[PDB]
């Protein structure tokens, strides 16, 4: 059986009927051998004493009921004098003596022990207490563990332990952490993230060895700051760098939505000091802020923000909010208002570029986007888009701009069961004020103009048909569709060469991409278009009408050349018109556990495939899977879409031919083994390699892992630089719902992470 059920074997019971509502006026059953006293105010029971009200069951040798002074409203005090056993749908308590106030719900049990019902955890204390209407559990000289009875694996003890049910956190004074009877850690005061609604067990110290830092260790400290905020402070020692990286994480929930901040700070670095002797400081740091939320269904807030001390940061330090595969850090803020027919968004976009060829980058400071939609005018749908943006460079010698844009659009949609057509007419109107042109214009033949207008109509017409047939020959009840689709697109030529290109990159065209009406993103380059796109998709549906297969192929035929008036693209030939661009795609779900996918993009101007991808996957479940995949990008494609130096530089110019394999298998329901290998076939070299092993039990889990990855490039020896890391991690289980074997997390841990392809 699976881990979860094995663990549930040791979690007690809860028999007896579950009562809904309160316990207040519910009947009270009392069995004993004797009742002395005046019953309502003073009662002393005895022998075999058993009491039941609602979900609670008390049992003891002697029980005393009382009432009291402070006239007020009625004061009810209960005492239990031997072999005390308390039982309910939450907890089981046992001890020599007990006390309760039924009005305030405050309770004491002396020299007692507790065990949860319906979930893991148990422990003991000199004094167990309930306070604040069962919000607070207090253990004087207490212990806790999530271990099943009979299992001594680990425990936490303290002179004082206070668990807060609402905040889901325990404070522990004089905490000691124990493995078996042996304490291995002491702390005067600790806070731990512990509660029934917690998604992760509380953290413990761990360690790893790396090529970059040598020996490393971390001491996570949880801090519950206030309601809706918490933090984790993690000193992280890195030996080679001779100092401590102080990692700080802050998490919050607000009305504006949820967020996280990270500030990691390394006061001095020996390695960086040696690589930069003349530099003012060796400190290294990272700040990261992520926020997203939608408030009152209308306001939408977003922050994606990363700033580092220097371009080598992610090559040097752990990849969590960033990666050593990143070419730049993104800094983005946006606020927007959206209702059904309207939205407007203001935003800032800045970038910190890593490599030095040019670290110069354009920013949008700010950008305003507006959309208005009206669907009902006659048979027509209408909309208007508009944008205002201010572009600024990090360099002071580079063009600055303001750009305003208006794009009204009207279309006539028409539909049958078998057919569809849509006609669309649109105007594109853009105005630029460009400044700081002096430096640019002295270095260039083609001049940028201060004032630019670009106005131009667009016409587009789309159509699709769906043909069907039965396939009995394939299998009973199978259906096949044929879906031809065609588009004509016309936009007139406008010479844009006097406009700097700030925001426009060449888009990839996969099958869906073929039908897009733009060659570039952004507004700075809009290609002329006179063209017809044609394609066909075929789909196969099974007896249950589930699509099991599709394939699609299409091309774009150009009646005239696509021109912006500034065309910098280095192609392999002069082809202008005809079918230049082709793309195809396929998906096959072979069985419940098996699938394959592929796509290809081809452009005749490259005399080659632009890019292609392939994958096949077997997956039985989250713990058991195998995947092979392939990615290709041609040297011609690199030379066409990327800056000149990529085409001349060894780490770039060959493009991508990359095979990878990923696999995981579970063992004995407690073990998970996982591996991934990624290989460049041009260079006959490893891109990435990873192995991991995890063992999971009811009260804890242990993962050893390894990764060797490309970390950079050595300009002298002209070869790749690799980083190796190997590490151990121990987590506490039974503190949350997770019975997983950690397969998925491990599959996500490397620089080329796993994605389920079906």
């Amino acid at each position: 059986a699976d881990l979860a059920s094995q663990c549930m074997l040791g979690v007690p019971s809860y028999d007896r009927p579950l009562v809904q509502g309160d316990t207040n006026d519910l009947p009270v059953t009392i069995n004993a051998d004797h009742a002395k006293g005046d019953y309502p105010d003073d009662a002393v029971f005895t022998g075999s004493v058993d009491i039941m009200q609602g979900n609670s069951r008390l049992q003891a040798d002697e029980v005393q009921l009382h009432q009291k002074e402070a006239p007020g409203q009625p004061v009810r005090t209960v005492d239990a004098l031997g072999n005390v056993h308390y039982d309910d749908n939450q907890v089981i308590l046992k001890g020599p003596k007990g006390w309760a106030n039924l009005n305030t719900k405050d309770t004491n049990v002396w020299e007692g022990d507790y065990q949860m019902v319906g979930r893991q955890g148990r422990g003991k204390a000199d004094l167990m207490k309930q306070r604040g209407e069962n919000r607070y559990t207090i253990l004087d000289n207490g212990s806790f563990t999530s271990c099943l009875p009979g299992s001594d694996t680990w425990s936490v003890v303290g002179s004082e332990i206070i668990h807060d049910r609402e905040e889901q956190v325990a404070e522990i004074w004089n905490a000691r952490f124990k493995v078996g009877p042996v304490p291995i850690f002491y702390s005067p005061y600790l806070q731990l993230p512990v509660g029934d609604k917690r998604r992760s067990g509380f953290l413990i110290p761990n360690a790893k060895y790396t090529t970059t830092n040598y020996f490393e260790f971390y001491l996570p400290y949880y801090w519950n700051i206030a309601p809706n905020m918490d933090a984790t402070i993690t000193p992280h020692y890195m030996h080679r760098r001779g100092n401590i990286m102080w990692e700080n994480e802050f998490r919050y929930l607000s009305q504006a939505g949820a967020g996280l901040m990270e500030l990691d700070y390394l006061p001095s670095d020996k390695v960086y000091e040696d690589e930069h002797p003349n530099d003012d400081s060796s400190r290294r740091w990272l700040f990261y802020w992520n926020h997203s939320g939608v408030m009152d269904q209308v306001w939408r807030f977003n922050v994606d923000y990363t700033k580092v001390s220097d371009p080598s940061y992610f090559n040097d330090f752990d990849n969590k909010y960033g990666s050593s595969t990143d070419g730049y850090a993104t800094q983005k803020f946006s606020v927007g208002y959206a209702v059904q027919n309207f939205n407007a968004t203001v935003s800032t976009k800045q970038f910190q570029v890593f490599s030095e060829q040019n670290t110069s980058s354009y920013s949008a400071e700010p950008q305003l986007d507006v959309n208005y939609y009206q669907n009902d005018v006659g048979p027509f749908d209408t909309r208007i888009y508009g944008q205002a943006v201010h572009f600024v460079n990090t360099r002071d010698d580079m063009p600055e701009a303001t750009r305003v844009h208006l794009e009204p659009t009207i279309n006539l949609p028409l539909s049958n069961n078998w057919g569809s057509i849509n006609t669309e007419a649109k105007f594109l109107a853009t105005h630029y004020q460009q400044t700081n042109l002096d430096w640019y214009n002295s270095r260039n033949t083609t001049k940028l103009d201060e004032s630019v207008n670009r106005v131009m109509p667009q016409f587009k017409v789309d159509g699709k048909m769906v043909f069907e047939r039965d396939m009995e020959m394939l299998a009973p009840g199978y259906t096949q569709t044929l879906e031809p689709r065609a588009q004509y697109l016309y936009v007139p030529y406008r010479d844009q060469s006097d406009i700097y290109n700030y925001d426009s990159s060449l888009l990839q065209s996969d099958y869906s991409g073929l039908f897009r009406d733009r060659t570039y993103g952004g507004l700075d380059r809009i290609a002329s278009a006179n063209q017809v796109t044609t394609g066909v998709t075929s789909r196969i549906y099974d007896d249950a009408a589930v699509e099991r297969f599709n394939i699609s192929v299409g091309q774009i035929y150009y009646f005239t050349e696509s021109r912006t008036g500034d065309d910098n693209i280095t192609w392999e030939n002069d082809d202008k018109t005809g079918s230049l661009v082709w793309a195809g795609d396929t998906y096959w779900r072979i069985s419940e556990r098996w699938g394959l996918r592929g796509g290809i993009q081809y452009d005749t101007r490259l005399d080659n495939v632009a890019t292609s991808n392939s994958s096949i996957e077997y997956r039985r479940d989250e713990d058991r899977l195998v995947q092979l995949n392939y990615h290709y990008a041609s040297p011609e494609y690199i030379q066409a879409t990327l800056p000149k130096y990529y085409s001349t530089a060894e780490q770039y110019k060959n493009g991508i031919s990359q095979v990878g394999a990923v696999a995981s298998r579970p063992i004995a329901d407690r073990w998970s083994i996982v591996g991934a290998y990624y290989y460049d076939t041009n260079a006959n070299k490893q891109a990435d390699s990873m192995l991991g092993v995890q063992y999971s039990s009811c009260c804890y889990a242990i993962r050893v892992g390894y990764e060797r990855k490309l970390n950079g490039w050595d300009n002298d020896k002209q070869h790749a630089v690799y980083d190796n890391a190997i590490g151990f991690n121990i987590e506490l289980r039974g503190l949350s719902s997770n019975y997983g074997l950690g397969t998925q997390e491990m599959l996500r841990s490397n620089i080329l992470p796993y994605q389920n392809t079906l």
Partner: protein, 150 residues
């Protein structure tokens, strides 16, 4: 044996429905509402008094951006965007049927064009919502057929 499709993309019992989610003004809800409208579906409020009306409830999108391939220095060449959507179709009398969409799109990185690349990403994401909506619609006949069978 090809014949023009004689049936509607959306099953007859689904030609009137409730659209519901926690982000009705978001882009996923817009893409879905638009696809339903182009398929000739009448959308009603969840407050409507017309009974026996199926309800499409959209869960929250997940959008991941992963490094798909690296250059020889370990820098990202191609990024992969993955969009996943969970939804349910409640046929008020019978049962609750989960459906999902998954969309992959990719693009090449350009640190010298970062601002441009950011815009490219926006464009791609905006298109993926449309794809997701389409995927969900194409799963409707399987719901209709699964309900008849049981």
């Amino acid at each position: 044996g090809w014949h023009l499709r004689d049936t509607t993309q959306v099953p007859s019992t689904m030609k009137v429905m409730i659209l519901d989610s926690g982000d009705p003004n978001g882009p996923l809800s817009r893409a879905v509402r638009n696809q339903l409208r182009l398929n000739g579906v009448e959308l009603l409020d969840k407050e409507t008094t017309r009974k026996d009306v199926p309800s499409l409830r959209l869960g929250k999108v997940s959008i991941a951006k992963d490094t798909a391939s690296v250059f020889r220095n370990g820098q990202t060449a191609e990024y992969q965007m993955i969009m996943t959507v969970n939804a349910t179709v409640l046929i008020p009398g019978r049962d609750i049927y989960p459906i999902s969409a998954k969309v992959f799109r990719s693009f090449f990185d350009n640190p010298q064009m970062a601002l441009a690349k950011d815009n490219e990403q926006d464009m791609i994401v905006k298109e993926m919502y449309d794809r997701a909506a389409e995927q969900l619609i194409r799963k409707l006949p399987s719901i209709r057929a699964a309900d008849i069978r049981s």
